[PDB]
Amino acid sequence: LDAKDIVELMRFLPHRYPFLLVDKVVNIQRDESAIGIKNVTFNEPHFMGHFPGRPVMPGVLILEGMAQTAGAICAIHNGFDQYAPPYLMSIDKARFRKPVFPGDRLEYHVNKVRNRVDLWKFQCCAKVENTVVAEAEICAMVMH
Amino acid sequence: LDAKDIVELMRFLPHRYPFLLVDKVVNIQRDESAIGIKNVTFNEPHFMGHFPGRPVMPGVLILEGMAQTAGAICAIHNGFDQYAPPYLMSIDKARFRKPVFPGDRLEYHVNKVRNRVDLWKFQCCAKVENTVVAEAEICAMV
Amino acid sequence: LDAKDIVELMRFLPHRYPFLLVDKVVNIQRDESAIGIKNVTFNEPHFMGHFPGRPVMPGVLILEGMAQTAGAICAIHNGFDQYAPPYLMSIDKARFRKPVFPGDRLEYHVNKVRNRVDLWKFQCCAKVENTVVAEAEICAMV
Amino acid sequence: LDAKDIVELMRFLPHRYPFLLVDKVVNIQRDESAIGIKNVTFNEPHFMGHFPGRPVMPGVLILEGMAQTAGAICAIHNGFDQYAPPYLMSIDKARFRKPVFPGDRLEYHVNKVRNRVDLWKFQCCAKVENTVVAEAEICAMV
Amino acid sequence: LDAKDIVELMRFLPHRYPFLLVDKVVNIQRDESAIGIKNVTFNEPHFMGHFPGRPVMPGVLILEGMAQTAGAICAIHNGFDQYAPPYLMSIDKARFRKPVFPGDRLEYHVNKVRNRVDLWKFQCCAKVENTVVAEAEICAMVMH
Amino acid sequence: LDAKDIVELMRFLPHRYPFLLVDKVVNIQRDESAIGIKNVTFNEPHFMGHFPGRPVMPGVLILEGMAQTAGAICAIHNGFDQYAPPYLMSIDKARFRKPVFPGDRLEYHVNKVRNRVDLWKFQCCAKVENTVVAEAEICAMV
C-alpha cells in the first residue's frame, strides 16, 4: 500500500500553513480508501484562541483534515496535483463524539463512495487510538 | 432589537484570535434568531495558505462563523458567558454555493430550532449581499 | 469605471501579508481618483496588540491603506507593477477624527493632485458609512 | 537622566505584540525630551510582507515608533499609565529620507512642543547612526 | 506513575505559545525520571521557515522540549510552579542522530542526575518509535 | 573584510521567518572567522510566550543564531548556498552567563576549528556590548 510524507502531499495539495492539516497519508489503496495522519500539538496557531488556557481541537479543523486526506488521494490517483485546487461543496452527517487535545494523534479513515467528473464524495471517520472521535460525509469538486 | 460589538461578544465567546470568526451580532431576537457579521479581508492569517496567490475563504470557517453567532446569542440569552465553553456536536446539510473573497461581507442568519439542557441546534444560512453563499444546520452543547 | 479585486491588486502592489492593507479598489478613474476598500475584522494580527481586549484600528495602518490605494492606481495607470516597489516620502495634514473597529468597512477616497517622474502625491480621505474618519495628504516615489 | 526597559514601558504603554514598537526609552528628561530605542531585526512579522525577499521597514511603523516614545514619556511624567490609552490625532511634516533595514538600530529623538489637557504634540526625528532617517511632528490625545 | 496533560503543565511551566514545546508528561517518577510527549505536526509556526518546502524539526527545539520536560517534573516535585521561571545554564554532549518530521512523535526520556538549590541537571534522550533521535545533558536554574 | 546584509544572507541560508536568526554577518574572514549580528527586539514572535510580561531571549535561539552565522560563512566560502540545507549534529560546552533582552544587540563571534566533507565545527561565543553572554561549540553537516 502507498504512503505520502508531507513534502509529497505538498505536490497534491495546494494548502499551506496555517491550513495544511494532515501530516501524512498511509495505506493508500488507489482511490478508494486511505488513512490520513495529523498530530495534534499545543504549538499550533489555532490553540492561541481555541481556547485560551484550554486548548481543544476545533471540530471544523478535524473536518478539514478529513477533507484534505480524501482530496489528496483523489489528486494522486487522477494524475492531478495542486494548480488544480479543490472546492468544498457539502458536508453531511457530521458528528463529533469526543474532544481531542494536544498530544493526541488523529487518524482520518476515508472511504471512497464516489469520484468522477472532478467531484468526489467520501465517508470519513476520525479516530484517536481506535476510538472514534468524529465522522462525516464530505463532498468536494475540483477546478483547473 | 439587540446588538453586540466585538468587545461585548468577547464576554460570551471564549474564542480569541485566530479563531474568533464573527465581528458583530445584530438583530438579536432573544434566543431565536440573529444575524452575525464577519468582514472578509486579505489581512487574515488563513489566507497565507488558503490559497497562496489565490485567497478564498475556507468553507469550514464559514461554518465556524455561523456556529459562533448561534452559540453567542445562546450564551447571551441563557445568562451564560465564556468560562462555560461550547462544544460542537453535529453539522448537517452543509452546502456551499459560492466562494467568498477578500472584500466580501458575510452575514450569518441563524434561526433557533432548539436550545435546552446546554444543547442548541440552529438553522443557519450565510449571505453576501442578499445572495446565499452557504447553509448548514449546526448543533452544539455547553 | 475600472475595479480591481485582491488578486489583481497583487500584480500592482508588491505588499503581502501582513501588510497588504486594501482588499479592493473601485471607481478607478485612470490615475486621478479611486476608492480603496478595506474590511476591518477582528481576525487581523495587529488586533492582538492594539489593543488587548480593546481592538481599535491603528491610524498609521489607515494611512498605509490610503497610500496603497493611491500607489495601486498609479501603478496600474503608468504600466508599472510590483518588481518596481514604492517608497513613501511624505505625509502631511494627517488628521484622525474617529476610531474604527472590527465590523467596520473603510473606503479610501483618493484624488490625484500630482503624478510624474516616479513621484505622486494624493489627497486622501477615509470614510466609514459616509462619515469621514480620517484624512491625509500622502506623497511617495517609485 | 531616566530610562525605561521594555517591562517598565509595558506599564505606561497599553500596546502589545505585534504593535509595541519601541524596546527602550533613554535620556528621559521629564516630559520635554527623550530618545526611544527600536532594534530592527528580520524576525519581525511585518517583514513577511514588506517586502517578500526585500525586507524594509515600513515608514508608518517608524511613525508609530516615534509616537509611542512620545506617549510613553508623557504617560510617565503625568502619573498616567496604560488603562488610560492614547489616541493619535495628527501627523504633519512627516518626511522619510532613507530606508531602514534589518540590523539597523533606530533612535527616536522626541522634543516636547506641547502637553496639556490630555493632549500632547511632539517634534520627532528618527536617526540610524547619527544619520537622520525620518522626521515628523506628531500629536495625540489621551 | 504520575502524568500531566497540557493544562496541568501550564501550571508548572511559564512557557506559552509559540514556545511551549511539550504536550504531555508521563511515567513521572517523582523527580528522578519522566517521559515528555511532543507531537510534531506541519501546522507549527517554525516550519514556515525551517525550511520552506522542506519542513524539518530544528534540533534546538528538541533540546528545548527536553529541557521543558525536565524543568516541569522538577517544578512539580519541588512544590514550585510558574511565577518562578527557569533559566537555562548549560547544555553538554548534545548529539543529533536523525532528523524528525511532521507526523513524528517525540518522546523525551529524562533522568535526574541532580536537583538541589534551585539548580537541576538531567540526562535526556529523544526517541521517535524506540529509535534514539537525539541526546543531551541539560542544566538549568530557577529563580523566584 | 567581507560582509553580508539580510538579502544576501538569504542566498546562503535556506532559513526564513520565523527562524532566520541573524540579521547581518560582518568581518568575514574567508571561512575561518566571522561575526554575526542579531538585534533583539520585543516585536519578535517568541516573546509572546517566553515569557508573558517578562520577555527574555531563549538560550536555544542564541545557539541557533551562532549556528546560523557559522553555517552562513561556510555556505559562502564553499560555493554552496541554500537548496543544500544544513543539519545540526552536535552542541557541546554550551554555557549561558547572562540573560539578554529587547534592546540588546547580539554579536556572534565564530571561529573555524574544522570544515571539510560537508561537516564543519565552530567555536562560538555571543557578546552583548563586549560582555560574553554565552558560548558553545557547534557542529553541523550539509
CSV table of C-alpha atoms in Angstrom, one decimal, chain D residues 15-107:
chain,number,residue,atom,x,y,z
D,15,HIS,CA,0.4,48.4,23.2
D,16,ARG,CA,1.4,44.8,23.0
D,17,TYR,CA,2.8,42.5,20.3
D,18,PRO,CA,2.7,42.8,17.4
D,19,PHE,CA,2.4,46.6,17.9
D,20,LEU,CA,4.7,47.5,20.6
D,21,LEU,CA,7.3,49.4,18.6
D,22,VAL,CA,9.9,50.7,21.0
D,23,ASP,CA,12.3,48.5,23.0
D,24,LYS,CA,13.7,51.1,25.4
D,25,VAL,CA,13.4,54.8,26.2
D,26,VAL,CA,16.5,56.7,27.4
D,27,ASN,CA,17.8,60.2,28.4
D,28,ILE,CA,14.2,60.9,29.5
D,29,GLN,CA,14.2,64.5,30.6
D,30,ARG,CA,10.9,64.7,32.5
D,31,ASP,CA,8.4,65.4,29.8
D,32,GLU,CA,10.3,67.5,27.4
D,33,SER,CA,12.6,65.2,25.6
D,34,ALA,CA,13.6,61.6,25.3
D,35,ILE,CA,15.2,59.1,22.9
D,36,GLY,CA,13.2,55.9,22.1
D,37,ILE,CA,15.2,52.7,21.0
D,38,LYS,CA,13.9,50.3,18.4
D,39,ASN,CA,16.1,47.4,17.1
D,40,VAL,CA,15.2,46.4,13.6
D,41,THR,CA,15.5,42.7,13.0
D,42,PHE,CA,14.4,40.4,10.3
D,43,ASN,CA,12.5,38.2,12.7
D,44,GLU,CA,9.5,40.7,12.9
D,45,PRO,CA,6.1,39.7,11.5
D,46,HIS,CA,5.7,42.8,9.1
D,47,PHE,CA,8.8,41.7,7.2
D,48,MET,CA,6.9,38.7,5.9
D,49,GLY,CA,5.0,41.1,3.6
D,50,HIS,CA,7.1,44.3,3.4
D,51,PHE,CA,8.6,43.1,1.3
D,52,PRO,CA,8.9,39.5,0.3
D,53,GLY,CA,12.6,38.9,-0.4
D,54,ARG,CA,13.2,42.6,0.2
D,55,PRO,CA,12.7,43.5,3.9
D,56,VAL,CA,12.5,47.2,4.5
D,57,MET,CA,11.0,48.9,7.5
D,58,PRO,CA,7.5,50.5,6.8
D,59,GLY,CA,7.6,54.3,7.3
D,60,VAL,CA,4.3,54.3,9.1
D,61,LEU,CA,5.8,51.9,11.8
D,62,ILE,CA,8.7,54.4,12.2
D,63,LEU,CA,6.0,57.0,12.8
D,64,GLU,CA,4.3,54.7,15.2
D,65,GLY,CA,7.7,54.1,17.0
D,66,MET,CA,8.1,57.9,17.5
D,67,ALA,CA,4.5,58.3,18.7
D,68,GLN,CA,5.0,55.6,21.2
D,69,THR,CA,8.2,57.0,22.7
D,70,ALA,CA,6.5,60.4,23.0
D,71,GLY,CA,3.3,59.0,24.5
D,72,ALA,CA,5.4,56.9,26.9
D,73,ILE,CA,7.3,59.8,28.4
D,74,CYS,CA,4.1,61.7,28.7
D,75,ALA,CA,2.4,58.8,30.4
D,76,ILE,CA,5.3,58.5,32.8
D,77,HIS,CA,5.5,62.2,33.6
D,78,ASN,CA,1.8,62.8,34.2
D,79,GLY,CA,1.3,59.9,36.6
D,80,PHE,CA,-0.7,58.1,33.9
D,81,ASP,CA,-0.2,54.6,32.7
D,82,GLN,CA,-1.9,52.1,30.4
D,83,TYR,CA,-5.7,51.6,31.3
D,84,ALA,CA,-5.7,55.3,30.0
D,85,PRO,CA,-4.9,54.6,26.3
D,86,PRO,CA,-3.7,57.2,23.7
D,87,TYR,CA,-5.4,58.3,20.5
D,88,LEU,CA,-3.3,59.5,17.6
D,89,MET,CA,-4.8,62.8,16.3
D,90,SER,CA,-2.4,64.4,13.8
D,91,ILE,CA,0.8,63.8,11.9
D,92,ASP,CA,2.4,66.7,10.0
D,93,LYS,CA,5.6,67.4,8.1
D,94,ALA,CA,6.4,63.7,8.0
D,95,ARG,CA,9.4,63.1,5.9
D,96,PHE,CA,11.2,59.9,5.1
D,97,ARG,CA,14.7,60.3,3.9
D,98,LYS,CA,16.4,56.9,3.9
D,99,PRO,CA,15.2,53.3,4.1
D,100,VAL,CA,16.0,51.3,7.2
D,101,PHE,CA,16.7,47.6,7.2
D,102,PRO,CA,17.3,44.5,9.5
D,103,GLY,CA,20.4,45.1,11.6
D,104,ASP,CA,19.7,48.8,11.9
D,105,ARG,CA,19.1,50.5,15.2
D,106,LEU,CA,16.6,53.3,15.4
D,107,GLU,CA,16.8,56.1,17.8
